[PDB]
Each structure stands twice: as structure tokens, then as C-alpha cells.
Design an enzyme around this catalytic site. Structure first.
Site, mmCIF file in Angstrom:
data_model
loop_
_atom_site.group_PDB
_atom_site.id
_atom_site.type_symbol
_atom_site.label_atom_id
_atom_site.label_comp_id
_atom_site.label_asym_id
_atom_site.label_seq_id
_atom_site.Cartn_x
_atom_site.Cartn_y
_atom_site.Cartn_z
ATOM 1 N N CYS A 54 0.788 -1.236 0.000
ATOM 2 C CA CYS A 54 0.000 0.000 0.000
ATOM 3 C C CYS A 54 0.812 1.273 0.000
ATOM 4 O O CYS A 54 0.518 2.173 -0.774
ATOM 5 C CB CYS A 54 -0.970 0.099 1.167
ATOM 6 N N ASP A 92 -7.443 4.313 -4.438
ATOM 7 C CA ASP A 92 -6.707 3.273 -3.716
ATOM 8 C C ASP A 92 -6.376 2.149 -4.676
ATOM 9 O O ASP A 92 -7.262 1.377 -5.064
ATOM 10 C CB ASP A 92 -7.508 2.772 -2.533
ATOM 11 N N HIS A 122 -2.898 1.567 6.738
ATOM 12 C CA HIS A 122 -3.175 1.517 5.290
ATOM 13 C C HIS A 122 -3.148 2.908 4.685
ATOM 14 O O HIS A 122 -4.077 3.713 4.879
ATOM 15 C CB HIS A 122 -4.525 0.881 5.029
HETATM 16 N N1 LIG Z 1 -0.812 -3.792 4.548
HETATM 17 C C1 LIG Z 1 -2.254 -3.935 4.484
HETATM 18 C C2 LIG Z 1 -3.017 -2.848 4.126
HETATM 19 C C3 LIG Z 1 -4.387 -2.978 4.069
HETATM 20 C C4 LIG Z 1 -5.002 -4.185 4.367
HETATM 21 C C5 LIG Z 1 -4.245 -5.274 4.727
HETATM 22 O O1 LIG Z 1 -4.893 -6.488 5.018
HETATM 23 C C6 LIG Z 1 -2.862 -5.150 4.784
#
Ligand SMILES: Nc1cccc(O)c1
Length: 246
Positions: A74, A127, A112
Site C-alpha cells: 500500500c 486506492d 493503510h
Molecule cells: N498492509 C495492508 C493494508 C491494508 C489491508 C491489509 O490487510 C494489509
């Protein structure tokens, strides 16, 4: 200095330098999710001892994702996409969110990282760096129901957070993540601070494919199917399909 718009656009399958409009933003968002997989496989190898994201040169991430064709996480994919959108003329604001966990709680508050774009008097969520089932085209920052690829979305307000919620066919509304919109910041990326479970996914033309450990999920026009993968050959075929892009 090695970030290059044209090279990035070619990597995601986008022609020319499309105009700074909502239609372009929607196209860029979907194309990015189809062409650039989420993959945490080698994320630890790129972490800085500093724990400050700024000590990870953007050119390193660009080279891994764009030049070399790999996926990322992310703070890699949305960090690159923020830069691309800014160089294409959008008013992009970085935001961080807490992710809904399987047990129904929300995780750490800024785990996130993603972005908002304010365009023509409206704000959109952007996103391209989220592993699990989520929106392939930008959402409006609104509790009004929005529909795309057979699923419904809304962004509700609860206790000082805006909560992205998703509803596929045949299932109830479920939160995806929550964030404080007033902490959005044009410069927010500058402030970010047995093998582990691997997460890999990408969008398709009408949905998304997601592999979390052995747990394989697909959604196609809103219809979800899941299977825990047993065979090594089938597992590798799914990994290949995700990482090959579309
Ligand atoms: N690193 C991350 C970011 C958003 C959701 C998730 O399950 C993991």
C-alpha cells in the site's frame, strides 16, 4: 529523478497523456489495479532501518514496480500513484486508514495508506494498493450508495471516522477500512513511518482475484467464490495469473 510519467503510463496500459478529468481518473485507477498486482512477498527487503518512508527513495520503488514489472504494497503502490496523479495535474491528498480485521475490530490507525482527489468540487477516494476485495474505480466521499462491477459501496460516518463499506451480491454490508478525512494532507507521504502470510491480488475486467496464503477469492460481476488451494501446481498457476497482470 527516474520517475517518468510516460514509462508509468505504458506500464499500466494507458495511451498518451490523458486529460485531468474524472473519466481519466477512473480509467487510470482501474488500469493500475489490473496491471500492477498487490504483492507483499519481498516488501521486507525494501524496508529502511530508519523506519521513515522518506528514506526509501521513490526511484527505488519506481524501479521495482514500473521498470521491473513487479507488484508492491500500500505505501509503494499508492505512493507511486499519488505522484503520477500529481504530475497529471490532480489535487491529491494522502490519507491513512485502519483496516477491518477478520475478528471485526479495526487494526492500527495508520496501517493503510491511500489518497483522496478533489476534482471539480467533489472528493474521490483513490486506492490502488489494497490487497483484499475493494473498489476498482474511485469512490465519492459520500454515504450515498455507489455501484460498480456488481457490488455496492458507501462511505458512512461513525465516531469521527469515514468508513468504506462494501456489499457484493448475496451478502451483507461489511466495512473495508476507516479513516479521518480531516487528516488528509497533500504532503502526507513525507510523514509516513516460516515466511509471513503472503498477500497477492489484482483486478480483472469485471472484478478481482485475491490470494491470501492458500485462500483464493474471486469476484466476477459481484458474484464471489472462494477456495482453499491444496495442490502446489494449482497454487502456482494462481500466483502466475495474478502476477502476470491484465
Ligand atoms: N498492509 C495492508 C493494508 C491494508 C489491508 C491489509 O490487510 C494489509
Amino acid at each position: 529523478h527516474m520517475f517518468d510519467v510516460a514509462k508509468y503510463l505504458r506500464r499500466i496500459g494507458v495511451e498518451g497523456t490523458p486529460p485531468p478529468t474524472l473519466d481519466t481518473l477512473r480509467h487510470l485507477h482501474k488500469r493500475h489495479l489490473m496491471a500492477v498486482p498487490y504483492d507483499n512477498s519481498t516488501a521486507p527487503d525494501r524496508l529502511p532501518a530508519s523506519r521513515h518512508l522518506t528514506n526509501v527513495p521513490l526511484d527505488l520503488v519506481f524501479g521495482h514496480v514500473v521498470t521491473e514489472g513487479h507488484g508492491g504494497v500500500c505505501y509503494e503502490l499508492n505512493r507511486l500513484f499519488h505522484t503520477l496523479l500529481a504530475e497529471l495535474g490532480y489535487d491529491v491528498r494522502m490519507v491513512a486508514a485502519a483496516v477491518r480485521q477478520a475478528n471485526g475490530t479495526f487494526g492500527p490507525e495508520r496501517e493503510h495508506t491511500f489518497d483522496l482527489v478533489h476534482l471539480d468540487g467533489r472528493t474521490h477516494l483513490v486506492d490502488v494498493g489494497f490487497p483484499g476485495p475493494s473498489y476498482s474505480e474511485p469512490l465519492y466521499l459520500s454515504e450515498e450508495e455507489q455501484h460498480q462491477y456488481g457490488c455496492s459501496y458507501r462511505v458512512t460516518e461513525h465516531d469521527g471516522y469515514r468508513v468504506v463499506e462494501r456489499r457484493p451480491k448475496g451478502s451483507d454490508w461489511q466495512p473495508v477500512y476507516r479513516f479521518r478525512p480531516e487528516l488528509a494532507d497533500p504532503s502526507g507521504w513525507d510523514a509516513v513511518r516460516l515466511a509471513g502470510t503472503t498477500f497477492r491480488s489484482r483486478a480483472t475486467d469485471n472484478g478481482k482475484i485475491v490470494l491470501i496464503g492458500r485462500r483464493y477469492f474471486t469476484v466476477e460481476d459481484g458474484v464471489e467464490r472462494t477456495k482453499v488451494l491444496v495442490k502446489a501446481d494449482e497454487f502456482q498457476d494462481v500466483v502466475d495469473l495474478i502476477l502476470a497482470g491484465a
